[PDB]
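Next up, sample data.

:::
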Amino acid sequence: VNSFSGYLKLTDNVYIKNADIVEEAKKVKPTVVVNAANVYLKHGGGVAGALNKATNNAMQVESDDYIATNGPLKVGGSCVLSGHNLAKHCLHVVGPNVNKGEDIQLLKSAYENFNQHEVLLAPLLSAGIFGADPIHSLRVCVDTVRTNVYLAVFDKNLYDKLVSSFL
C-alpha cells in the first residue's frame, strides 16, 4: 500500500491522474519524482521549470554544480539528484525533444531509467513542449516500465483523451 490517491489503474503497474505534478509531489512527498529534463539540466519551462520554481531555484543550483562536474546527460539518459522540498530524490530523465529533431526511438531508452526505482511519480516523457505525441508516450511507458509508476497529466482535456484512447 502507498499514499497515491485518485489514480485510474491502466495496467498491473501503471496508474494515471489529472494532476499538477508539483502539487502532487508536495502532498505525497514520494521517494522519487521524475523531471522532464534536458541534457544541460536547464529547467526553464514545462515540467522542469515548474518543479524548479517550486524548489525556489534550489534544483537549478544543484543541477548547475552537477553539470560543471559531469558534463551534459545523454538523450535517453538520467541522473538522480535531490528532491528538495518535493520528494526524497528527483530522477532527471531526458526524453527526446522533437522540436530539436531528436530520435523518438530514444523514448524507450528514456523510460528504461524508471526501472531502477520501485515506485515513481512522473510526467509523460517527451510530451508537452518536448513535442511528442502523448498517446505514444503513454504506450511506450506501459510497454517499457515494469516498476510502479504514477503518471500526472496536467491538462484535463489531454488526460481524458489518454484514458479514452488507451488500449
Notes: The first strand starts at residue 8 and ends at 9. Strands lie at 8-9, 14-18, 32-36, 78-82, 89-93, 119-122, 148-153. The first helix runs from residue 21 to 28.
